[PDB]
């Protein structure tokens, strides 16, 4: 009898605007951060630029501790008190399209060899930023050693009391 | 307020129900313990009384075949063990799982002595009970009702002490020094800073 019509949902005109992010006051360009989650967990790093997909452009000089130019989510990071000046650094060319990528069909396996396929643009751009920051970092004592070491909780340390 | 592989408590000066009241709670939290010197747990009341609140527990038992009736242990250790396996629903895995975490001795056996033990304030005849009352010293009690070792566990609890005195003294000289010198030596600049760093 009925056998429903194969017409379709065509949905109501929604009312949800895309307003920009309001970041917390602790994060300001130049601030040292502690990475909580991910591959480089508990690794001290440097904040550079706010990107336009609500992520943080983060270096933490590759020559010091081996952490490259990388995206980071703001909720999975701590903001410490220390800062460094970024007046002799560019960070204009970097955008969301800079970190674009072709996800590969798919594929796996035998040795899905992989020590390959890094751009010369990415290697040279790493050298320019690291050279500017190291001149700034060598002003204050014991900062180069601070970024090298990792963060780990001790017996007695209660996170709710600490300042960071 | 921190977790450890084990926690050794030194009864003495400690009451009973109030101590037992804690020793238990813990367990229900995958902890551990190992009371000692039980032969020194204090109990509110005038010696006499108590012994009555006992001679009555001792006159409670099956009628048609004791053997299977309430087993009245005499030795202390087990006592401060009863006042507990009664504060726990000890008829459900969880219960057991809890008692296996425990252990109580009257005296101080090896697998410890060489370890630091602690007290549990909220329960020390001196922070509670008012001054001018009367408290019974377990052991002594037990005796008058069984337990034939209130003279052995005493002849030993000595072969120990006597020594602990030595270990000490030796632990002053070495320290009466490791402190002496930290007096001159670079006790400078590096402090005029660390003294502030704090």
């Amino acid at each position: 009898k009925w056998y429903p019509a194969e017409e379709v949902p065509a949905p109501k005109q929604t009312r949800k605007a895309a307003r920009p992010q309001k970041l917390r006051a602790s994060l300001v360009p130049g601030t040292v951060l502690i990475l909580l989650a991910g591959r480089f967990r508990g690794k001290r790093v440097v904040y550079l630029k706010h990107l336009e997909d609500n992520t943080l452009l983060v270096s933490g000089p590759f020559k010091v501790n081996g952490v490259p130019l990388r995206r980071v989510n703001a909720r999975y990071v701590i903001a410490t008190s220390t800062r460094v000046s970024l007046e002799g650094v560019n960070t204009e060319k970097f955008n969301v399209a800079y970190f674009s990528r072709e996800k590969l069909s798919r594929k796996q396996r035998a040795e899905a060899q992989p020590k390959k396929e890094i751009k010369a643009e990415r290697i040279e751009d790493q050298k320019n930023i690291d050279k500017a920051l190291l001149a700034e970092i060598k002003k204050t004592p014991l900062l180069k050693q601070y970024l090298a070491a990792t963060f780990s909780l001790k017996n007695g340390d209660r996170p709710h009391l600490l300042k960071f | 307020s921190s977790f450890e592989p084990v926690v050794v408590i030194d009864g003495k000066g400690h009451l009973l129900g109030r101590l037992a009241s804690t020793v238990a709670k813990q367990l229900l939290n995958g902890q551990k313990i190992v009371v000692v010197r039980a032969e020194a747990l204090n109990i509110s009341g005038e010696f006499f009384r108590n012994k009555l609140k006992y001679h009555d527990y001792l006159r409670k038992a099956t009628a048609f075949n004791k053997t299977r009736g309430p087993f009245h242990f005499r030795a202390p250790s087990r006592i401060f063990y009863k006042a507990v396996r009664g504060m726990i629903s000890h008829k459900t895995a969880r219960g057991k799982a809890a008692l296996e975490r425990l252990k109580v001795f009257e005296g101080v056996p090896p697998p410890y002595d060489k370890k630091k033990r602690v007290v549990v304030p909220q329960a020390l005849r001196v922070l509670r009970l008012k001054p001018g009352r009367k408290y019974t010293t377990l052991g002594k009690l037990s005796t008058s009702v069984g337990w034939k070792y209130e003279d052995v566990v005493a002849k030993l609890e000595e072969k120990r002490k006597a020594r602990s005195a030595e270990y000490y003294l030796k632990k002053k000289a070495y320290n009466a020094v490791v402190a002496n010198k930290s007096a001159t030596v670079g006790t400078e600049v590096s402090e005029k800073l660390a003294a502030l760093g704090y």
Partner: protein
């Protein structure tokens, strides 16, 4: 025909015996003592039971049976020497052995693989109790069967594999550890 077996049919022999007038409870205890033994071992054991050296352990059907010292072999107190139960089972083994000889199988490797004894239709017969009451007096006959097999080595081995699966970030963990 034949109960739930799980062995090679080509290297096997069998023998049945339906509507036998023996105790169903006693024949079960004889058929479980013999089970899992070598064929030549068994025929000597059943002869020793008749002459009172060895004994049959009564495990399941054993209420109000007396104790005996011969039961210590198996680790059970109660045991008996059922004559009539053994003579029927001893007969079926000699039939099953001759069946294997016809096929051309080795006697030394031959062992009892499967054995079973379920109930039969009961023969009915009456008695006279007090105050003119008639009760039954029935028999409990048996349906015996057994299977013998050429015993051999190398039974599993076996079996499963994997065809593995893991994520990209989980794959990436292996890449670094091979380098270091």
């Amino acid at each position: 025909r034949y109960g739930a077996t799980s062995t090679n049919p080509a290297k096997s022999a069998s023998a049945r015996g339906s509507y036998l007038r023996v105790s169903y409870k006693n024949t079960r205890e004889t058929a479980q003592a013999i089970s899992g033994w070598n064929l030549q071992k068994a025929q000597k054991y059943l002869d020793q039971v008749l002459d009172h050296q060895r004994a049959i352990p009564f495990r399941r059907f054993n209420s109000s049976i007396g104790r005996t010292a011969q039961g210590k072999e198996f680790g059970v107190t109660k045991a008996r020497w059922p004559a009539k139960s053994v003579k029927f089972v001893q007969g079926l083994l000699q039939n099953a052995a001759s069946n294997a000889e016809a096929k051309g199988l080795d006697a030394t490797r031959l062992y009892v693989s499967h054995i079973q004894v379920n109930q039969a239709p009961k023969q009915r017969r009456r008695t006279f109790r007090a105050h003119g009451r008639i009760n039954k007096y029935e028999s409990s006959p048996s349906h015996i069967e057994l299977v013998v097999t050429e015993k051999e080595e190398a039974v599993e081995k076996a079996s499963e594999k994997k065809v593995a699966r893991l994520s990209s970030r989980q794959r990436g963990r292996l890449a670094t550890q091979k380098r270091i």
